RNA sequence: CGG
């Protein structure tokens, strides 16, 4: 049947100038040495990505799918969802969102300038009046930082971003935002990934794991997922949306956005030229996360049925997936996964790496992270979330005239606070830089999965207690996997090894303590791992007085 | 570019 794309031969052009690094990285050249390995994907590599994702799809459904789709619609039907006022939608546009072709940008939209509010009204009326004319879209390459891996080809080609003009995005939100906040949770319940913090993700997986008489786990990820999404898949997304109780005006807008935007359309590069046509998901539209998550859930739950996965518990995180099931013995389990992959491939969701059965929770990696284990202050086992730090370390080293890495550092410190690599390496480097800049008591802003919240470095110990618990300051005896991986990653980026970080950290601690106040609370809590005479830490009054539920839900 |  359908091709994912077709191209004119016009280049994918850059959204402005694309920054290369500088000869000195003053913030990060005491963190690591191999700055040559850190790189940023650019539009120069866009064509190679385009070759890798242009292919022919041949979806083939079956009773298992149909049965699942059916159940998902009955679940959707228990949702009622309102329209958003043009104004409400305007004010959810982010502060630096790409400006519109019709001579205004995000400032005008969020302030509700009349010029802007006007253009958008007319755009909405055209949605309601015309359910057919394709809507044009811009195509850009994403700028994104990685460490080179010669094992996996050297340098990654940039992924493709495909979005309509600002005005349409606002209309998108009007028609569909309230649904994005309610549907995924409603059809998937506890399987919905983006509702849990790290400690909750870990708790869920453990409960899941212990509930089985004899558990088996595996993860799945679809190769180039957005290009594998079919016109049919997209129309089937519409019907899932339509199964909620909605005002009539939503339905028309939703339906019109589907046929004119979501199922496909022409693509223009930044220079204005016609670039290609698209019959797959455009990553850049409002329905991207919801769509991926839901369409992934359907296919996956079908494939579980297709393959005989017994008593599955799922966690869906976009196109990443984990399933914890009752094992049928390794002979059968291996067969069943081949079947799963076979079904998923029939549903047009082929794998990147073939999945594999596992019987130890530390060896399953999904949503870029994994559960590991260490000992707590009282000798008991303590389970927590962590990840390969390679890419975090690389991003910690991205400095340009326009961009600072301190934000990245913070993001990781908060998300992965219990990790040996955050405690020994990142926390040590973070606090050291800020002390010396004399900017310890100055807010930064941290963004995990969507929005951006302001944080004061001196509040980390409270925020970490609230979010990860007080054991997060006291854990020891990390696992072989986790020790091996951290050492290896530090070697690979030319950063000092752990024993050096022990030295630097003692020194940082002392400085923090000598400044007294909150700084010294940072010193005692965050760096107690670093001294022989470990102190007695106690819950922090500050912590109880805190609401963080907006951060990961 | 979107949650
Ligand atoms: N809008 C948007 N969507 C993204 C981005 N990164 C990933 N996604 C979506 O999530 C899908 C799966 O992500 P991933 O497994 O990391 O990459 P892929 O499967 O190789 O495309 C993508 O195909 C996109 O639709 C991004 O930066 N912006
Ligand atoms: Cl303990
Ligand atoms: Mn994928
Ligand atoms: Mn319709
Ligand atoms: Mn993925």
| DSSP for A216-258, written as a single string | EEEEEEBTTHHHH--HHHHHHHHHHHHTSB--HHHHHHHHHHI
The string of DSSP codes covering A11-32 is ----SS------S--TTTTTT-
> What is the H or E stretch that residue A187 is in?
helix A183-188
Reading the block at residue A503, the tokens are 């030295």
Resolution in A: 2.8
- How many whole angstroms from its chain centre is CA A213? 32
* Residue A94 CB lies within 7 Å of the nucleic strand B: yes
Q: Which residue is nearest to nucleotide B3 (CA to C1')?
A: A289
Locate tokens 């986790």: which residue? A482
- Cα A141-A147-A150 angle, rounded to 5 deg: 100
Instruction: List all residues 6 or more positions away from A25 whose beta carbon is below 8 Å from its beta carbon.
Output: A35, A397, A399
Residue in A97, A78, A272 with CA at minimum distance from that of residue A173: A97
Nearest in space to A395 (alpha carbons), one of A378, A377, A379, A415:
A415
Distance in angstroms (rounded) separating the CA atoms of residues A57 and A347:
10
Query: How wide is the angle at C-alpha A328 spanned by C-alphas A326 and A330, nearest 5°?
Result: 115
CB A318 within 8 A of CB A296: yes
Q: Which residues contact A123 (CB under 8 A, 6 or more apart)?
A: A167, A168, A170, A171
Which SS3 state, helix, strand or coil, does residue A119 take?
A: helix
Residue A455 φ/ψ region, left for φ over 0, alpha for ψ in the -120 to 50 degree band, beta for the rest? beta
Contact A218, A364 (CB under 8 A): yes
- DSSP class of A91: T
Q: Whose CA is nearest to atom 18 of ligand 1?
A: A224
A259 CA from B2 C1′ (Å): 18
| DSSP character at residue A45 | G
Q: Give Cα separations from A536 to A231, A383, A520 (angstroms).
A: 60, 22, 14
Within 7 A of a protein CB, which nucleotides of strand B?
Answer: 1-3
Q: How far is the CA of A180 from the C1' of B3 (A)?
A: 8
Between CA A489 and CA A387 the distance in angstroms is: 11
Q: Residues with Cβ < 8 Å from A179, sequence gap 6 or more?
A: A79, A81, A241, A244, A290
Give chain A's end-to-end CA distance (angstroms, integer): 39
Of the residues A159, A227, A320, A368, which should be mutated to test ligand 1's pocket, given the most ligand atoms within 8 Å of the CB? Answer: A159
Residue numbers 279-308 of A with CB closer than 7 A to any atom of strand B: 283-286, 288-290, 292
Give the DSSP letter of residue A458: G
Residue A221 is labelled as binding a ligand: yes
How far is A368 from A349, CA to CA, in rounded Å?
19
DSSP A351: B
Please give the method by which this entry was determined: X-ray
Pocket of ligand 1 (CB under 6 A): A 142, 221-222, 224-226, 281, 283-284, 288, 292, 318-319
Between the CA of A380 and the C1' of B1, what is the distance in angstroms? Answer: 46
Residue closest to A198 by CA, chosen among A383, A393, A379: A383
Domain ranges of chain A: 1-368, 369-553
Pairing of strands A265-268, A137-141: parallel
Compute, in angstroms, the gap from residue A445 CA to the centroid of ligand 3.
28
By three-state DSSP, how is residue A353 classified?
coil
């Amino acid at each position: 049947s359908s091709m994912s794309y077709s191209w004119t031969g016009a280049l994918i052009t850059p959204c402005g100038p694309e920054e290369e690094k500088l000869p000195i990285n003053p913030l990060s050249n005491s963190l690591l040495r191999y700055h040559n390995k850190v790189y940023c994907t650019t539009s120069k590599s866009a064509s190679q990505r385009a070759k890798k994702v242009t292919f022919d799809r041949t979806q083939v459904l079956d009773a298992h799918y149909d049965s699942v789709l059916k159940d998902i619609k009955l679940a959707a039907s228990k949702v009622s969802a309102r329209l958003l006022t043009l104004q409400q939608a305007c004010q959810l546009t982010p502060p630096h969102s790409a400006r519109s072709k019709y001579g205004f940008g995000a400032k005008e939209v969020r302030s509700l300038s009349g010029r802007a509010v006007n253009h958008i009204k007319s755009v909405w009326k055209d949605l309601l009046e015309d359910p057919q004319t394709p809507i044009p879209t811009t195509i850009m390459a994403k700028n994104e930082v990685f460490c080179v891996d010669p094992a996996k080809g050297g340098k990654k080609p940039a992924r493709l971003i495909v979005y309509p003009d600002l005005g349409v995005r606002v209309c998108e939100k009007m028609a569909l935002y309230d649904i994005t906040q309610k549907l995924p949770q409603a059809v998937m319940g506890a399987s919905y990934g983006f509702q849990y913090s790290p400690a909750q993700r870990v708790e869920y997986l453990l409960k899941a794991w212990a509930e089985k008489k004899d558990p088996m786990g595996f993860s799945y990820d679809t190769r180039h997922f957005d290009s594998t999404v079919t016109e049919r898949d997209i129309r089937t997304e519409e019907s899932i949306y339509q199964a909620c109780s909605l005002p009539e005006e939503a339905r028309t807008a939703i339906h019109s956005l589907t046929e004119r935007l979501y199922v496909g359309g022409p693509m223009f590069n930044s220079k204005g030229q016609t670039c290609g046509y698209r019959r797959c998901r455009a990553s850049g539209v409002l329905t991207t996360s919801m769509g991926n998550t839901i369409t992934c859930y359907v296919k996956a739950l079908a494939a579980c049925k297709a393959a005989g996965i017994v008593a599955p518990t799922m966690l869906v995180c976009g196109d990443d997936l984990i399933v914890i099931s009752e094992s049928q013995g390794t002979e059968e389990d291996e067969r069943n996964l081949r079947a799963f992959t076979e079904a998923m491939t029939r549903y047009s969701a082929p794998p990147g790496d073939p999945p594999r059965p596992e019987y130890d929770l530390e060896l399953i990696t999904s949503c870029s992270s994994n559960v590991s284990v260490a000992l707590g202050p009282r000798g008991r086992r303590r389970y927590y979330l962590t990840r390969d730090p390679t890419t975090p370390l690389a991003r910690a080293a991205w400095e340009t005239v326009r961009h600072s890495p301190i934000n990245s550092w913070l993001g990781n410190i908060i998300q992965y606070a219990p990790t040996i690599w955050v405690r020994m390496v990142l926390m040590t480097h973070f606090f050291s830089i800020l002390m010396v800049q004399d900017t310890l008591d100055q807010n930064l802003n941290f963004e995990m999965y969507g929005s951006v919240y302001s944080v004061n470095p001196l509040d980390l110990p409270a925020i970490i207690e609230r979010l990860h618990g007080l054991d997060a300051f006291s854990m020891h005896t990390y696992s072989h996997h986790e020790l091996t991986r951290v050492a290896s990653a530090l070697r690979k980026l030319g950063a000092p090894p752990l024993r050096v970080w022990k030295s630097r950290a003692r020194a940082v601690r002392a400085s923090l303590i000598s400044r007294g106040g909150k700084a010294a609370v940072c010193g005692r809590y965050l760096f107690n791992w670093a001294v022989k005479t470990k102190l007695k830490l106690t819950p922090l009054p500050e912590a109880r007085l805190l609401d963080l539920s907006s951060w990961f839900t």
